[PDB]
């Protein structure tokens, strides 16, 4: 009658929690070559990624640059919400218009604009020119950075530097082959698109073709623009932020909380699903049990994020005593979400590509990457050089001494993190590990990897 | 109903994997003295070793020298395939002609051969002379290294240095006693063997008797030549390699793959078994489960090799998340192989002789030794002297500065491995540990050791 | 002819530099008890301290609180200049009015002042009440914190809470004994001082007597107010800052530069000496040679500060390769300053009280303490509790999640420094060490300690 | 700065520039860090462990980044030395004086 671990209640200790280090993938019959394995997976019930990886929406991980890089790599990025609503909406706009985003609503300047303003717009959107539209609304010309390369006077108006009409243009609904043919024939890099009245409706640049060739796995929406997600909280400021982000063109809204088994979080999810659910996917916060995942599914979430204190040495585990091992948590969440076809996102605890393979085999559909991507080039922060090494830092007015020691050392030296380089190499290494796991387990797709079996190892299997 | 580790499927976590550190051998009733225990075991269904150890077929472990040493020690060597087909066939031929291999097809030279060519052949085959056969095909004499010891001019032909006929010869089918008596009577070290018509058919040297007395446990084929195995891959190049190796006289072909539960590997095994299966034994690649071992047995493999990611901190376990603890894998593989009499080779994860005893007690017939033999003298590599120690390395044209620092330090200092000495001492230590285990468990033979019992130990049993 | 260290110029290597670890103080004939040694010394040619220690004028060391504590301990503090001119002048005013500073120019309030503003003034000046003066200029009452202890409504005007006139007052020029007698007789803690016409001229509080009894070594000016110094740079902003500080009531101005052997620094020192030299003492920046000290003396400096890269592992020594060992630098600076009676301040390189004794025996008159005082309670920074220990830190809007991990850890954990406790204990330990040194060397005064002899030790004397 | 003050006119830089982007060698990514390496035919197995690790992981050196940043840091240190010694030109820095320190001056 007594429980072997103490007491009389057999459900006081609910279960035995397994972490990533407790299990290994068992080899199975395999006709799968790692180079031909298909790693595409569902992020939500309507969005499918070519690479099942998402950035972690932390202030040190994901901004517009990281979102663009992740969308190009085949995954997606989620913008963090530790900033004003206007800044987050502007970052969403930057991601949406980065690549093949000027086809329908192009950015234009006026003939009275100075060269500095045009250069600022070009630097923000990473484009090399803009069409010029006057007060009447007529396409009067185009101004590119070949026109303003050597202009010393940056206060000069656009009208003195632009290339006047007529321009080489295309009709609405012009195919990519015809546009490329025009660009090759006239040896230009830009092609405005006008309607029957000769009024500007879009712009095609050589950047579109270059990026399509260079990044064949890019994640795009129906209009051909890069996908991006954004995080929101709970409350009224959260509602205003979510509405502003939806207006800016976000594709995924993540109700990001540490403990989503709360009435407020579920109410926010239901409200968002009812208000903008026809346009935007809604992802629920972090839930580590089956009941919480079922509650989020009932509230109408399109995807469920799992991790609640998954790290072994974690602040939640030490200060609060609350936690859940990640493998068991994913298993329970999948046991609640799978009958309704709701994807599961693993979040936290991942240190290697083997952990990603284990998380996907436990039943999750995507994995969210945090500290793995913190030091990359596309992550926020400034690159500094200290003691013969590169670091990334997150860094005078009254110190006018030219020979002071603070002048001899770089700024931001305190609080720096190692520099990891480009994001593409990290993503490629992770994808190679995942493909090796798929080849070992005989999984042609991720949906077949989700049916792979585990072997539990003892402590002796973790010894150096 | 719910699984205690998570989810609803009770087969998601298939089993608990035990490694070598998790178990110990239980003493049983024993009348066995370690000095008299019989350690002979089956390598395949037709080949029996006196010492149940095999080399690992890695480019840093097994070449012709290691194969010869392992065969003399009582085990066998498997040649690595990271080299051209002609080179691997040449190494097979070198092993096959090292000891008592000239009795039926001796190596011969011609009077037109220079002394340099004869010296090269003698250095390759480790013989001290050759019979001489002219264009017409008569045995005209013998050339040994006592004849060419002081010849300063190495371009001198054989005819100017050889000892002319008549020679002391013996008839075909001469017993060892008669040949030794002739050698003792005439006080020579070589004895050609001729047919009734006086044509050369073989050669006996004192090396045969010396090696027979020195190495009583040598592994030999039907003709008394040393046993050797070779590794092949999968594909058309692999088929050509296998055919060339069989022509060279290989005894065992090992289809060495990382994951043998693949249709291509099984097809290769079946093709080899149908083509050269009447002459050569075929060993399947590495398999960690019962189903894979059963598939290899059905395909026609003569032996099954097991280890798939057996190391605790392993590249397969960290990058792909795939692995299987070795004790459980051996148990499952034996559960599939034993009813058909197919031997099991335990490959990987062995660090001590206790691990070898545990692997043999788990049901395996032989153990394959890897990094334990990487630094021995017979392993490939160059011996260097660095900082008062001996190391083995795996290592000018435009650096003509005679006082440069690169002249002051040995080449290959970077990337060296410790030197281990002769292989025989290592094999003797491992065999002594195995004999002690056999004495403790009361096992007169390896087949009785395979019925020994284990005790599972906790984490506290591994603490220093 | 050649120099043994290289070259032909015997002055290329000018001298051998001795640091603190290279020398020890030799015991001499002593009739001195450590408890009776006199540690008073000259800071400048007109200012004498009771304890020859000065705070280091760094933004982590000296602000108004540290300056007050240092003045009470018997030394002095120099306010850092890494802040706006108005803030530094406010800190000067706070220090000057802390203790016995209302005797001639008291802080007053008007009857229309709210209780919040009076409370803010009392908190700034560390007083427990203010006299009230109307628009006409008459002393109408006094408001103390016993009157407003339980006034929950902090917007209440002073007129509703003050103790109305007539008050217990004393005539101008009242002796301290008479004021204390009045305070004892009427059992109050405050005594306004009025002239013959009944107009408010000053204020005496029990704080004056309490602090005089508690801190008998306090450094005071002619008016009986605590001494304070401030740092200024070079330039026009520096001139405005210096004029504002002199108007605020500063006593010492320190021209704080890393390399004071510059024409700009000397010109600034000369200008300050010409303009405000009758009221304020001017101390020159850091100089490490005899010629630089002579230049500062000629420019008209009242004291000369020495240290230029005195630390063994220092940023100046590593990045620039420039430095000077502190003992030799002090010897040279004293050799240039002593004939004119200009005191020397040893700045940098001090780690123990033995180093302070060595610096004073080398000829310096005062020592400037930096990192020794960084972690004390009176130094700038905020006290935090982390992992069972007290630390000092030098430190939300959008993180509204109540269960996030940033809510679980204290703010300022990054970049924290250890807590050292009260300043008085550190000063007392250093003074005890200095007194022990004086007793060993037989020096009744610091001027006698400046004539002590050294013994030079070898490397073997520094071995553990 | 010390070498130029002793009388040398130029300095030659070796290991300080070994791992920069412009130095010879290939950039590799190992264990979350960038390295520079100075690096199959018969290993056609697709699931082998040598396929799971990059080639050249052994014998690698840390990556330093662009050369311009290193040169700028060195020149800044030299300019600080010139400002301390009062040398407007390198020829005046060659007339600077030294002070000899003892062993105690090298202890942390
Ligand atoms: N004015 C301006 N232009 C910038 C700036 N940064 C990037 N660009 C331009 O943006 C276009 C694409 O930027 P990329 O660097 O290729 O791509 P990215 O979106 O990953 O940053 C290029 O012109 P392109 O003509 O599309 O390509 P190409 O002619 O260089 O091949 C490039 O010159 C900037 O700060 N100011
Ligand atoms: N020409 C030539 N001969 C070589 C060379 N290396 C070894 N030999 C000869 O090969 C024979 C056997 O070689 P061992 O060293 O005993 O054996 P191994 O096969 O283990 O290497 C010896 O002659 P033996 O007459 O059989 O033995 P013994 O008279 O030395 O006892 C030895 O002299 C070489 O580079 N060149
Ligand atoms: N209103 C107000 N008063 C403050 C504040 N902080 C300190 N005081 C008062 O200042 C006087 C002296 O402050 P202390 O703390 O003794 O000295 P300090 O200058 O070293 O800080 C005290 O009143 P006392 O009457 O001089 O001394 P006692 O009656 O407490 O002995 C104390 O109550 C504050 O934030 N607000
Ligand atoms: N559609 C167009 N019709 C006519 N002229 C055009 C058109 N697009 C660009 N031009 C003009 O052609 C010139 C170069 O065009 P393009 O856009 O290829 O240059 P760019 O991107 O600035 O070049 P670079 O990348 O070398 O700096 C500029 O003077 C530009 O104004
Ligand atoms: N069967 C034989 N009949 C006749 N002469 C022989 C025969 N075998 C060897 N000889 C000759 O006898 C001499 C020595 O023979 P043996 O083979 O014993 O020498 P070896 O092996 O060269 O000696 P070592 O190992 O001491 O250098 C040589 O001149 C050799 O040619
Ligand atoms: N000179 C004075 N003449 C008349 N009344 C006075 C005088 N000084 C103070 N008082 C009044 O006497 C009361 C107490 O005075 P006192 O200054 O001793 O108190 P306090 O410093 O506020 O006390 P505590 O330190 O206990 O809070 C207050 O109501 C105050 O207004
Ligand atoms: Mg361009
Ligand atoms: Mg271009
Ligand atoms: Mg011989
Ligand atoms: Mg011999
Ligand atoms: Mg009081
Ligand atoms: Mg009181």
SS3 track for chain C: CCCCCCCCCCCCEEEEECCHHHEEECCCCCCCCHHHCCCCEECCCCCEECCCEEECCCCCCCCHHHHHHHHHHCCECEECCCCCHHHHHHHHHHHHCCCCCCCCCCCCECCCCEHHHHHHHHHHHCCCEEEEECCCCCEEEEEECCCCCCCCCCCCEHHHCCEECCCCCEECCCCHHHHHHHHHHHCCCEEEEECCCCCEEEEEEHHHHHHHHHCCCCCECCCCCECCEEEECCCHHHHHHHHHHHHHCCCEEEECCCCCCCHHHHHHHHHHHHHHCCCCEEEEEECCCHHHHHHHHHHCCCEEECCCCCCCCCHHHHHHCCCCCHHHHHHHHHHHHHHHCCCEEEECCCCCHHHHHHHHHCCCCEEEECHHHCCECCCCCEEEEECCEEEEECCCCCCCCCCCHHHCCCCCCCCCEECCECHHHHHHHHHHHHHHHHHHHCCCCHHHHCCCCEEECCHHHHCC
Segments in B85-191 forming alpha helices (H): 85-96, 115-125, 176-186
| Cα-only R_g, chain D | 22
Q: Are B45 and B194 in contact (CB under 8 A)?
A: no
CA dihedral A158, A163, A165, A171 (to 10 degrees): -100
Question: Does the distance separating the beta carbons of A420 and D64 come in below 8 Å?
Answer: no
* DSSP run (H or E) holding A54: strand A53-55
Backbone angles phi, psi at C69, to 5 degrees: -65, -40
Beta pairing partners, B142: B131, B163
Question: Could you tell me which residues come within 8 angstroms of residue A243 by beta carbon, excluding any fewer than 6 positions away?
Answer: A275, A276
Residues of chain D with a following break (C to N over 2.5 Å): 39
| Cis amide prior to A180 (ω within 30 degrees) | no
User: What does the DSSP 8-state code read for residue B462?
Assistant: G
Phi, psi for B354 (deg, rounded to 5): -60, -35
Matching residue, tokens 């300095």: D11
Residues D59 and A141: their CA atoms lie apart, in Å, by 57
Could D80 and A433 be called an inter-chain contact, meaning their C-beta atoms sit closer than 8 Å? no
Give the whole-angstrom CA distance, residue B321 versus residue A101.
Answer: 40
Annotate B317-330 with DSSP letters as a single string.
IIII-B---HHHHH
Closest CA to C259 of C207, C199, C324, C318: C324
Cα gap C378→C375, rounded to integer Å = 8
Query: Are the Cβ atoms of A425 and D47 closer than 8 angstroms?
Result: no
Nearest-CA distance from D1 to chain B in Å?
27
Burial per residue of B173-202, b for 16 or more beta-carbon CB atoms within 10 angstroms, e otherwise = ebeeeebeebbeeeebebbbbbeeeeebbb
Q: Could you give the CA distance from residue C142 to residue C132 in angstroms, rounded to a whole number?
A: 5
Task: Tell which residues of chain B come right before a gap with C–N over 2.5 A.
Answer: 395
Is C211 annotated for ligand binding?
yes
C124 lines ligand 3 (CB under 6 A): no
Is A236 in CB contact (< 8 Å) with chain C?
Answer: no
**B113 three-class SS:** coil
Give the whole-angstrom CA distance, residue A229 versus residue A3: 47
Among B286, B342, B347, residue whose Cα is nearest residue A27: B286
How buried is residue B121: exposed, middle or buried, by Cβ count under 10 Å (0-12/13-18/19+)? middle
The β-bridge partners of C131 are C142
Pairing of β A78-79 and β A53-55? unpaired
Structure tokens at B390: 């001996």
Span from the CA of B207 to the centroid of ligand 10 (angstroms):
9
Measured over all CA atoms, what is the biggest interatomic distance in chain B, rounded to whole angstroms?
A: 92
| CA separation for the pair C206, C188 (Å, rounded) | 9
CB-based contact B77:B67 (threshold 8 Å): yes
DSSP one-letter code for A103 = S
| C158 in Cβ contact with C109 (< 8 Å) | yes
Q: Over the range A373-401, which residues count as b (16 or more CB within 10 Å of their CB) and which as e? A: bbbbbbbbbebbbeebbbbbbeeeeeeeb
- Asked if A192 contacts A202 with a C-beta cutoff of 8 angstroms, the reply is yes
Which atom in ligand 6 lies closest to the alpha carbon of residue C162? 31
Hey, what are A437's tokens? 């796991």
Would you tell me how many other CB atoms lie within 10 Å of the CB of residue B224? 14
- Partner residues linked to C157 by β-bridges: C114
Alpha carbon distance A67, A98 (integer Å): 10
Spatial separation of the C-alpha atoms in residues A295 and C428, rounded to whole Å = 65
Query: Which residues in B lie closer than 8 A to residue D32 (C-beta atoms)?
Result: none
For residue A166, whether the previous peptide bond is cis, meaning omega lies within 30 degrees of 0, is: yes
Sign of CA dihedral A114, A117, A121, A127: positive
3-class DSSP state for residue B406? helix
- Cβ atoms of A292 and A261 closer than 8 Å: yes
Q: What would the DSSP string read from start to end of B177-246?
A: HHHHHHHHHHT-SEEEEE-TTS-EEEEEEHHHHHHHHH-TT--B-TTSPBP-EEEE-SSHHHHHHHHHHH
Distance CA C345, CA C366 (A): 5
Q: Could you say which DSSP state residue B73 is in?
A: H
Nearest CA to ligand 4 atom 19: A146
DSSP D49: G
C122 has catalytic annotation: no
Let me know if B138 is exposed, middle or buried by CB neighbors in 10 A (0-12, 13-18, 19+). Answer: middle
Is residue B12 classed as helix, strand or coil in its secondary structure?
coil
Nearest to C395 by CA among C422, C420, C413: C413
Closest-CA residue to C282 (of C304, C306, C302): C302
Can you tell me which residue has the tokens 């991601």?
Answer: A95
Both tokens of B282, joined, read 């075929």
Interchain pair C320, D81: CB under 8 A: yes
Among B47, B22, B6, B109, CA closest to B326: B22
Distance set, CA B133 to CA A10, A298, B148, B157, B194 (Å): 90, 93, 18, 13, 12
Asked if residues C44 and C252 have their Cβ atoms less than 8 Å apart, the reply is yes
Q: How would you class C110 by CB atoms within 10 Å of its CB: exposed for 0-12, middle for 13-18, buried for 19 or more?
A: middle
Q: Which two tokens mark C126?
A: 């560390």
Tokens 């006047």: give the residue.
A164
Name every chain D residue with its beta carbon within 8 A of the beta carbon of A370.
none
Q: Is D83 on the interface with C (CB under 8 A)?
A: yes
Question: For residues A147 and A126, what is the distance between their CA atoms, to the nearest angstrom?
Answer: 16
CA neighbor of C334 nearest in space, from C283, C287, C269, C282: C287
Q: Tokens for B167?
A: 């020679």
Task: List the one residue out of C363, C366, C379 whose CA is nearest residue C422.
Answer: C379
Task: Record the tokens describing residue B70, joined without a space.
Answer: 């392992």
CB A205 within 8 A of CB A127: yes
Within 10 Å of residue C21's Cβ, how many Cβ atoms?
Answer: 23
Q: Report the distance separating Cα B277 and Cα B280, nearest Å.
A: 5
Nearest 5°: the CA angle C215, C217, C221 is: 105
Kindly list the distances between the CA atom of residue D100 and the CA atoms of A317, B295, C13, C455, D95, in Å, as whole numbers in the listed order: 56, 79, 7, 19, 16
What distance in Å separates the CA atoms of residue B45 and residue B252, rounded to the nearest whole number?
Answer: 11
CB contact under 8 A, B316 and D52: yes
Helix (H, G, I), strand (E, B) or coil at A110: coil
Tokens representing residue B124 in the block: 């390759």
Q: Which ligand is nearest to the CA of C66?
A: 3
Cβ within 8 Å of residue B97, ≥6 positions away: B107, B125, B225
B124 CB under 6 A from ligand 2? no
> Is residue C438 a contact partner of residue C449, using CB atoms and an 8 Å limit?
yes
Resolution for the entry shown, Å: 2.7
Does any CB of chain A come closer than 8 Å to the CB of residue D51? yes
Give nearest CA residue, ligand 1 atom 21: A126
| Structure token digits, residue A39 | 């790693």
| Distance separating alpha carbons of residues A50 and A40, to the nearest angstrom | 4
Positive/negative CA dihedral, A60, A64, A68, A71: positive
CB under 8 Å to A20, separation ≥6 — which residues?
A326, A327, A349, A350, A351, A354, A355, A358, A359
What is the edge-to-edge ordering of all strands in the sheet holding C139-144? C129-133, C139-144, C163-164
Strands (E), A309-351: 344-347
Q: Read out DSSP for A386-446?
A: ETTEEEEE----S---TT-GGGSS-TT-TT-EE--B-HHHHHHHHHHHHHHHHHHHT-SSH
- Closest among B301, B278, B358 to B325, alpha carbons compared: B358
Q: Which of C11, C316, C328 sits opposite D97 (nearest CB)?
A: C11
Q: Tell me the C-alpha to C-alpha distance, in Å, between residue A443 and each of A361, A375, A430.
A: 10, 32, 17
Residue pair C374/C460 in contact (Cβ under 8 Å)? The answer is: no
Three-state SS at A65: helix
Query: And the tokens for C20?
Result: 């603190």
Q: In this structure, are residues A126 and A208 in contact, taking their beta carbons and an 8 Å threshold?
A: no
Q: Are C260 and C287 in contact (CB under 8 A)?
A: yes
Helix axes of A263-276 and A290-299: crossing angle, nearest 10 degrees:
30
Catalytic position from the list C314, C337, C416, C420: C314
Q: Which long-range contacts (CB under 8 A, 24 or more apart) does C104-108 make?
A: C104/C201, C104/C202, C104/C223, C105/C202, C106/C130, C106/C131, C106/C200, C106/C201, C106/C202, C106/C203, C108/C132, C108/C133, C108/C200
Residue of A nearest to B459 (CA): A459
Which residues does residue A308 pair with via DSSP β-bridges, in sequence order?
A: none
Q: Is the Cβ pair D99, C17 closer than 8 Å?
A: yes
Q: Taking chain B, what is the end-to-end CA distance rounded to the nearest angstrom?
A: 41
Smallest CA–CA distance, residue A418 to chain D, in Å, is 8
Residue B119 C-alpha to ligand 2 middle, in angstroms? 11
Distance A96 CA to ligand 5 centre (A): 90
Q: What CA–CA distances, in Å, run from B325 to A16, B55, B359, B361, C242? A: 21, 21, 12, 15, 77
Q: What 3-state class would DSSP assign to B315?
A: helix
Alpha carbon of residue B192 to chain centroid: 30
CA-nearest of C239, C227, C288, C262 to C79 is C227
Whether residue A200 contacts residue A50, with contact meaning beta carbons closer than 8 Å, is answered with: no
Question: Hey, what are B158's tokens?
Answer: 């054989």
* DSSP three-state, residue B143: strand
Spatial separation of the C-alpha atoms in residues B393 and B409, rounded to whole Å: 14
Locate the DSSP E strands across D57-97.
61-62
Of the candidates A90, A55, A91, which has an alpha carbon nearest to the alpha carbon of residue A72?
A55
Which candidate, A92, A42, A84, places its Cα nearest to that of A62? A92
* Distance between CA atoms of residues C447 and A409, nearest Å: 40
Phi, psi of A3 (to 5 degrees): -70, 140
DSSP category for residue A160: G
Contacts of B135 (CB under 8 A, 6+ apart): B110
- How many angstroms separate the CA atoms of C190 and C142, rounded? 9
Is the alpha carbon torsion for C455, C460, D2, D3 positive or negative? positive
The DSSP string of A213-274 is: HH-TT--B-TTSPBP-EEEE-SSHHHHHHHHHHHHHT-SEEEE--S---SHHHHHHHHHHHH
Instruction: Kindly list the residues from chain D whose CB atom is less than 8 angstroms away from the CB atom of residue B257.
Output: 45, 47
Burial of A212 (0-12, 13-18, 19+ CB in 10 A): middle
Cβ–Cβ under 8 Å, residues A41 and A366: yes
> If you measure CA to CA, which chain B residue comes closest to D57?
B415
> Does residue A233 have a cis peptide bond before it, meaning omega lies within 30 degrees of 0?
no
CA B286 to chain centre: 17
Please state whether beta strands C129-133 and C78-79 pair in parallel, antiparallel, or not at all (unpaired): unpaired
Distance (Å, whole) CA C182 – CA C191: 8
């Amino acid at each position: 009658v007594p429980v072997p671990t103490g007491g009389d209640d057999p459900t006081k200790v609910a279960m035995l929690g397994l972490t990533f280090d407790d299990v290994l993938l068992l080899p199975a019959a395999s006709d799968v070559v790692p180079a031909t394995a298909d790693t595409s997976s569902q992020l939500t019930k309507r969005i499918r990624l070519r690479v099942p990886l998402v950035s972690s929406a932390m202030d040190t991980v994901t901004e517009s640059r990281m979102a663009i890089a992740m969308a190009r790599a085949g995954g997606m990025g989620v913008l963090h919400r530790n900033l004003p609503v206007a800044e987050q909406a502007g970052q969403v706009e930057t991601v949406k218009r980065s690549e093949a985003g000027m086809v329908t609503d192009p950015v234009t300047c006026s003939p009275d604009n100075t060269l500095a303003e045009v250069d600022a717009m070009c630097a923000r959107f990473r484009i090399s020119g803009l069409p010029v539209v006057d007060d009447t609304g007529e396409l009067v010309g185009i101004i590119t950075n070949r026109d303003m390369r050597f202009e010393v006077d940056q206060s000069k108006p656009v009208s003195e530097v632009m290339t006047k009409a007529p321009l080489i243009t295309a009709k609405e609904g012009v195919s990519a082959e015809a546009a490329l043919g025009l660009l090759r024939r006239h040896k230009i890099e830009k092609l405005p698109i006008v309607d029957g009245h000769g009024k500007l409706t879009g712009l095609i640049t050589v950047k579109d073709f270059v990026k399509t060739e260079q990044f064949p796995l890019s994640t795009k929406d129906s209009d051909g623009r890069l996908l991006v997600g954004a995080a929101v909280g709970v409350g009224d400021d959260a509602w205003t932020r979510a509405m502003t982000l939806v207006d800016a063109g976000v594709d995924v809204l993540i109700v990001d909380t540490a403990h989503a088994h709360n009435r407020g979080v579920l109410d926010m999810v239901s409200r968002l699903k009812q208000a903008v659910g026809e346009r935007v996917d809604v992802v629920g916060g972090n839930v580590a049990t089956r009941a919480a995942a079922a509650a989020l599914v009932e509230a109408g979430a399109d995807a469920v994020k799992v991790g609640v204190g998954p790290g072994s040495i974690c602040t939640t585990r030490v200060v609060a005593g609350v936690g859940a091992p990640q493998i068991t948590a994913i298993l329970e969440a999948v046991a609640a979400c799978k009958p309704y076809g709701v994807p599961v996102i693993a979040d936290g605890g991942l240190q290697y590509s083997g952990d990603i393979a284990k998380a996907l085999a436990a039943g999750a559909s995507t994995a969210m990457l945090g500290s793995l991507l913190a030091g990359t080039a596309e992550s926020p922060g400034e690159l500094i050089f200290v003691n013969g090494k590169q670091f990334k830092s997150y860094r005078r007015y009254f110190q006018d001494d030219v020979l002071s020691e603070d002048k001899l050392v770089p700024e931001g030296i305190e609080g720096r993190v190692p520099f990891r380089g480009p994001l593409g190499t990290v993503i490629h290494q992770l994808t190679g590990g995942l493909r090796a796991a798929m080849g070992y387990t005989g999984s042609a797709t991720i949906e077949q990897l989700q049916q792979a079996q585990f072997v539990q190892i003892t402590a002796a299997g973790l010894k150096e």
